[PDB]
Amino acid sequence: SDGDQCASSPCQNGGSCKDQLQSYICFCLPAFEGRNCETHKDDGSA
Ligand SMILES: *[C@@H]1O[C@@H](C)[C@@H](O)[C@@H](O)[C@@H]1O
Numbered sequence: 001s002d003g004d005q006c007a008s009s010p011c012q013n014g015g016s017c018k019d020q021l022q023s024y025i026c027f028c029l030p031a032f033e034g035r036n037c038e039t040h041k042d043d044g045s046a
Contacts, residue, residue: 012038 006017011026015037018025028037
């Protein structure tokens with residue numbers, strides 16, 4: 001699977017995705033979580 005696996009915005013919350021070997025990589029901030037930075041670590045009611 002050597003190619004690009006992030007040509008469809010897999011990560012969110014301003015996640016920095018980068019094309020790497022096999023799969024890709026998303027560099028986010030410590031205040032963000034989720035399988036693809038799609039969740040903000042705000043910790044409110046839920
Ligand atoms: C990509 O890296 C992450 C960690 C943030 O700094 C983004 O704003 C940047 O584009």
